[PDB]
Every structure is written in C-alpha cells, then in structure tokens.
C-alpha cells in the first residue's frame, strides 16, 4: 500500500545547454534527458504502485513531459522524447527573459501532487517527493514565490531534492533544508545517472537505513524588497516585516495600509 510519487523537475534552459554544447564538453542535454529517463524507469521498476511525473522547466513556460524493453517504459520514454522535442524545437527566444521559471515548475508539481493524492484510494498513503536538477543560475526575482512554494511543500510533507550540476543555488539549498530533502552538487557531469541512482533513488524510509552525504552549507541570505539582491545585513520593518537594504523614513509596503 506504499505508493511513492517521484516528480522530476528538469532545468531545460536553452541558453545554458547551448553554452554547454559550445564548450564541446562530454555532457550535453541529451545525456541529461537520458539519465532522467533511466532514473524514472528505475523508479517505476522498484514497485508497481510507484508513480512518475516529469516536468521540464523552460523560459517560456513549464512543460509536462510525462524491442526488448518494458512496454510501459517504452511508451513513457517515447512520450518524454516527443514532449521534449516539441518543447525545444518550438522554443523561440522572444524577449530578454533568460532566467528559468523554476518556481512555476515547482508550483505545477505541487498542484499535480495534490491532484494525485485525492485520486489515491483511502487504503493507501501516497508519499510524494520532488527532485530538481539545476543547470542555469539561480533567479532572485522569484524569491517570494519560491519561498511560498517551499512552505507549501513543507505543509504537505513533500520532499524537495536538488541535484545541482554547475552553479549552486541558495534557494534550492533552503528548499532542501526546510522540506528535509537532500542537496547534492555533482562533481562529474557524466556520472549524473549514477549519482541519481545512488542517492536520490531510495525513498525517505530507505534513506534512513542508507548512509548518505551530510547536508551542505545552506545559506539564508534574504532578498531586499527594493533591490531583489542577496544581502547580509538589512533594515526590516516591524509591522510588515519587509526587508530593505537602506533606512527609509516611510516604509513603502506600509503605504498600502491607510
């Protein structure tokens, strides 16, 4: 009766993968997608009751991605490949927006988990976790929405795991620490599949038995309301708790309340 749900969020930012292809490195977006598909196939292999969802995080929007091989796995992989092809080929850069919409993808993942939980029969409990692989740099403009998503995930007891590839993200560290998930930075990109199978494949009950890397140094720098940048020391209002980098005689947020 143990139903495990694994929603995998893939950072599909075209600019970062294009730069990676320009670097002519051994790791590309195709290999990352293959590793994600193999991890999902393994998750479905572990038990009948396991459910899988793959969400691709893109600049324009968030896309729900999902011969000797398993029949259900074959259809799932074909659907994932078709969806990722449709997303990438029709992805036209129209605007100066470059930061990935990670917060929206996590919100959609939470909504999908909420939908799945109701459809789960009352005799079974659907344990849900969200795995995020990070490719591009962190986005500071989405601080409030990301924190709201973290709090929503914590309220429903949903694990959030981050698998950072190149550049660390403070928001992902905070999400992993608050929701109880694991934060891991991959040293060798081609070993992404092995890292996922070794670390993020087991469930939280299985994570208790297995010895896993200790949590990384999570930062808690706040975002200034008028600058939206990381700060160490800032002015915080006493009424609305809004954070400001510099002293002001009249709080901007308190202006709303007359």
């Amino acid at each position: 009766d143990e139903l495990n749900l694994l929603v995998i969020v893939v950072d599909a930012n075209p600019i970062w993968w294009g730069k990676q292809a320009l670097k002519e490195s051994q790791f590309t977006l195709s290999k990352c997608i293959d590793a994600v598909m193999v991890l999902g196939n393994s998750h479905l292999f572990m038990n009948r009751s396991n459910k899988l969802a793959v969400i691709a995080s893109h600049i324009q929007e968030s896309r729900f991605l999902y011969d000797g091989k398993y029949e259900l796995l074959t259809s799932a992989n074909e659907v994932i490949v078709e969806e990722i092809k449709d997303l990438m080929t029709k992805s036209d850069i129209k605007g100066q927006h470059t930061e990935t919409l990670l917060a929206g993808s996590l919100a959609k993942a939470l909504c999908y988990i909420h939908r799945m939980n109701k459809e789960v029969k009352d005799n079974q409990e659907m344990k849900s976790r969200i795995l995020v692989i990070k490719a591009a740099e962190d986005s500071a403009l989405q601080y409030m929405n990301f924190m709201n998503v973290i709090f929503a995930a914590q309220k429903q007891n949903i694990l959030i795991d981050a698998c950072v590839l190149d550049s660390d993200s403070g928001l992902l560290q905070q999400a992993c620490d608050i929701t109880g998930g694991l934060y891991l930075k991959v040293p060798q990109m081609p070993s992404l599949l092995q890292y996922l199978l070794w670390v993020f494949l087991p469930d939280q009950d299985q994570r208790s038995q297995l010895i896993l890397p200790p949590p990384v140094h999570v930062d808690y720098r706040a975002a200034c309301f008028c600058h939206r940048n990381l700060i160490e020391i800032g002015y915080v209002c006493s009424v609305c708790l809004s954070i400001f980098c510099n002293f002001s005689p009249i709080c901007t947020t308190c202006e709303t309340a007359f």
């Binding site: 294009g18 293959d34 992989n77 070993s191």
Partner: peptide
Amino acid sequence: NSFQSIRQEMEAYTPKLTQVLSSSAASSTI
C-alpha cells in the same frame, strides 16, 4: 547563435543506452 545551434542539435535526438553510463564513471562515483 548558440541557442539556434543547440536547437538544431536537439532537433535530431535519439535515446542512448551505452553512453548513459560507463564502468569507469560508476567506479569513480562509488
């Protein structure tokens, strides 16, 4: 230009089996 190049590269994309992992990579990860 890089975005167009990666779009063209991923336009003709197929799943792989051998290139996903290697014995050396798995041993190093372990």
